[PDB]
Write an enzyme that holds these catalytic residues in place. Structure first.
Site, PDB file in Angstrom:
ATOM      1  N   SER A   1       0.869  -1.167   0.000  1.00  0.00           N
ATOM      2  CA  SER A   1       0.000   0.000   0.000  1.00  0.00           C
ATOM      3  C   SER A   1       0.912   1.225   0.000  1.00  0.00           C
ATOM      4  CB  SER A   1      -0.915  -0.011   1.245  1.00  0.00           C
ATOM      5  OG  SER A   1      -1.664   1.169   1.400  1.00  0.00           O
TER       6      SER A   1
ATOM      7  N   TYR B   1      -2.097  -1.146  10.180  1.00  0.00           N
ATOM      8  CA  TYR B   1      -1.998  -1.341   8.739  1.00  0.00           C
ATOM      9  C   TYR B   1      -0.721  -0.723   8.177  1.00  0.00           C
ATOM     10  CZ  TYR B   1      -3.919  -1.413   3.888  1.00  0.00           C
ATOM     11  OH  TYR B   1      -4.149  -1.660   2.546  1.00  0.00           O
TER      12      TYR B   1
END
Lengths: 246, 260, 262, 263
Positions: free
Chosen positions: C143, C156
């Site tokens: 990401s 995350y």
């Protein structure tokens, strides 16, 4: 047809090495191509034309804004608008900082940064008008890390990556993208002169212990120019056998 | 009084009569360094600024030199050598800005920004390194920007030059890595300069404080300015013995700009 | 131009969203594909059918990627059904938004386990065969949050940063082989997860207005003011798996509309 | 009283040896009161407390398994009881295991992730409320060059340290408008008992027991300065981040690596 069929590309510095390899891969993917940079020249052009697209050549000194302008206007006359601009400088000078000649510093900065700036400035209005464009800046691993004795080149390549980010941000809501490719060591005459002992040269910097090919750099350009890269903006594609990973 | 961490070191700060450069000169002097200030041309204010920096008991000079002219850079270094001694700490700071979209960015401004923000640092570093190597000690501190690590709209020339200055920093650090010379960069975010102060006062009167908040919200998560004193503190840290093995890196002072 | 004809791919977490888009693009490029999810579904068939529309061999296997024995079962199932795993796409696809102080410990552990440790185990299990054959692609779906931080996404961001670090090591340990390892770093992709995030923002700030909320959500981070698509992530995966990428090693392909550029 | 951290209370995890001890000593030298911490009580604890107390500040030592969230909380509560509110938290956890990925033991992977990453999350979570209430704090995460680049045979450690840098960014962003900062320090090879152990393992396996040869190869491969970073230098970076001049340094890395990441 092919992924870049119909697209008009200009490759600066495409007479040999990486620039020529990029031109070849773009034509192989269907782009019409203008090569910037004489029987041997005709042979080179015929080789690029073997991919079945329209190929032209021009001889603009990229340090002279008037000649960069003439390159763009030539392309517009011959093929139409410049849709893919590949900024490729292709010069190097190795020296410690203390003895680095001022004129070589200026030349490396001028051809990497200022020439890319002028070509991009001249091409962006048409791309905005037409709703599409690709600016592909050929940087280096040396735009992300330093190496001894390459102060001007590392400064220029870092600068070209910074420029890339700004152009991408200024075009982020359009069909125009700007990105950089960062090659590691590619087999070229300069690298051959510096260098069997190929292994020692590669081992220092490039964990794969093999060269990147001009075809692989070209393949990265084709990917960036493809529709799948519509939302790739302001980034680097590093093709370096692991150099920057360590 | 007692010796300070940089006592006896001679520093040169380019572009240091105002703003970030002046803050750096002030903190280096506070830490005990002798300092040479620099600007493009002589101004009536030079004496007062010199005496402001000299309030901390070190030797302070001022030398006007157009940093775009390699011969004037050389003259600055030779002047420092004659007046104070060998240049031991070089702070490359003189820099200019011009905000414009790429399409209309003036060619002369592009050239000026590259020349001052990148190539002048190269010239000054080239001129100072031989003495540093001879003595076995040095600091080269390059004042970059967050704009040397990320891009911002309408700052193409500045982002290119500041990215380039970070690349240069890495190379100089690697070429000197086995010596007592280090080279590093400081990367400030938005700093409260006198010019920025004027702009904020004007906007706060006209359209409003909240002017600060609107200006900073886009880029600087702290919603507060970096100060010139903080940039100076980073320079003092890099110049100190604790930073003897900090080489080729960036100290980012940006209220979180690059973290997001 | 099916550049992956002959190759067997395993995509984890591939029955929805980004994983499904990646699996679709791999199949379109000619790869045989094994889809994976935590538990079997009656709708599996339909999903499988879609992928198989591209004329390659497609299978489905339900494995809890947090259980190493089930990861091993997935690899052995692929080897028995299709042949040796040649392309491994590690794709986790879980999220929990919370400030650090109140971030649930169990959610932290689950995000670390599925994003990072599961990719470690699957890579461990696939590398021997790829070294023996002399070819492989390990493609880790990271990401932008593996390159920068964002508020309320501590777990995350940690997991995606860690996955990038893992990518570099695997690439370095295989640099002289025909195996590469790289990461793709998507920005905001319109997927049901991101739509849940937007719905929470819309209720909290915009009276439930999803159009207003979507624009505010995108403009915060993504200069293109548009979503990345799952097809674009899949195109990046196909590029990394192709022969033009034989010397792309240990790096990130960021597909983010400008997020990390500023 | 005139030292830059005078009166601040600092907790340094994993601080009875190596980098953590160097950080504790430099913080104390800068005027901070310091709590030391290690896995289990050791007969050498009192001598280490004496080392840190040589700078005239208050020092404590608390044994706590940093993988056990309850023992992390007990460390924080002990500090509040003995010295006061935790104002500087240094998350330091050097545990390492060198192996190729294919044979990397699962329990060692899990341990490195738990200690080098998840323990920092728990300790930060437990310290943030008090720092928010007081309007001041420092969270200093001891990462590594290995949190910015990879190295062969260090998959778990590189993943954990990269994760710790990501965590650092998020914490800094969530506190950016407060007097609390969070940053990471990224050392290269530091001269510590643990690094010497790693060099000795390589020396035995590849250099015939020759520590000089192994050390030269170790440093030449990665660290252009061809010299070690010192624990004092890492501590100096911690003092800098804890100082008022770093009030606007947020979510970044201070890399102390002799040029490792510059090339």
């Amino acid at each position: 047809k092919r992924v870049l069929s119909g697209r008009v590309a200009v490759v600066t510095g495409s007479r040999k090495g990486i620039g020529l390899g990029i031109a070849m891969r773009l034509a192989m993917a269907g782009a019409d191509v203008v090569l910037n940079g004489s029987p041997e020249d005709s042979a080179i052009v015929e080789k690029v034309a073997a991919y079945g697209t329209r190929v032209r050549c021009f001889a603009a000194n990229m340090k002279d804004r008037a000649q960069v302008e003439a390159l763009i206007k030539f392309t517009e006359k011959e093929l139409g608008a410049v849709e893919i601009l590949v900024n490729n400088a292709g010069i190097q000078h190795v020296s410690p900082v203390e003895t680095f000649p001022s004129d070589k510093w200026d030349e490396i900065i001028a051809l990497n940064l200022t020439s890319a700036f002028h070509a991009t400035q001249l091409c962006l209005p048409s791309m905005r008008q037409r709703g599409w464009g690709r600016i592909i800046n050929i940087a280096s691993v040396q735009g992300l890390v330093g190496s001894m004795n390459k102060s001007a080149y590392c400064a220029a390549k870092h600068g070209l990556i910074g420029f890339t980010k700004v152009v991408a941000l200024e075009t982020a809501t359009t069909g125009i993208t700007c990105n950089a490719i960062c090659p590691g060591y590619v087999y070229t005459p300069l690298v051959e002169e510096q260098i069997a002992a190929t292994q020692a040269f590669l081992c220092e910097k490039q964990p794969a212990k093999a060269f990147v090919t001009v075809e692989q750099v070209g393949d990265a350009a084709v990917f960036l120019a493809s529709p799948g890269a519509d939302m790739i903006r302001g980034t680097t594609i590093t093709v370096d056998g692991g150099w920057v990973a360590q």
